[PDB]
Design a protein around this motif. Structure first.
Motif: not given
Ligand code: NI
Length: 145
Positions: A122-126
């Motif tokens: 999720x952090x990677x996607x952001x």
């Protein structure tokens, strides 16, 4: 039109991409600009396709907050629709064997994917969504009048 090596992309222009990005960003390195800058014209078809597929298949999917409210979902959807329209021209160029993908080219994509996968998804996607400006500044080098 865009000219990604031998692949002409006619459905979308940079102004559309940029306005869609600024709306997305307003709701909110993996991509190395210096690496992208030295990608050959020939290699560009493969690499743009691979990156846009990754955004469409992994990044948007794993960005939870795109469904927070309907206007936000619409902004993300507009940007994804622009990426789909580009891939809809690149995919046939790949399936007609028009676009080169030398080992070096695959390794540049793997450098991106390794960086993306270091983080919680999720952090990677952001992070990856925030870097769409890097992606678009590179892509527009292939857009001609
Ligand atoms: Ni290849």
């Amino acid at each position: 039109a865009f000219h990604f090596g031998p692949c002409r992309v006619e459905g979308v222009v940079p102004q559309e991409l940029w306005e869609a990005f600024w709306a997305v960003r307003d709701t909110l390195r993996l991509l190395r600009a210096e690496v992208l800058q030295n990608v050959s014209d020939a290699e560009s078809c493969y690499l743009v396709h691979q990156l846009l597929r990754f955004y469409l298949d992994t990044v948007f999917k794993n960005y939870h907050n795109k469904t927070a409210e309907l206007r936000t979902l619409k902004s993300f959807s507009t940007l994804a629709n622009n990426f789909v329209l580009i891939v809809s021209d690149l995919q046939p160029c790949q399936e007609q064997n028009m676009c080169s993908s030398r080992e070096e080219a695959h390794r540049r994509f793997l450098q991106f994917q390794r960086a993306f996968e270091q983080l919680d998804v999720e952090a990677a996607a952001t992070k990856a969504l925030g870097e769409i400006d890097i992606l678009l500044r590179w892509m527009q080098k292939f857009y001609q009048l």
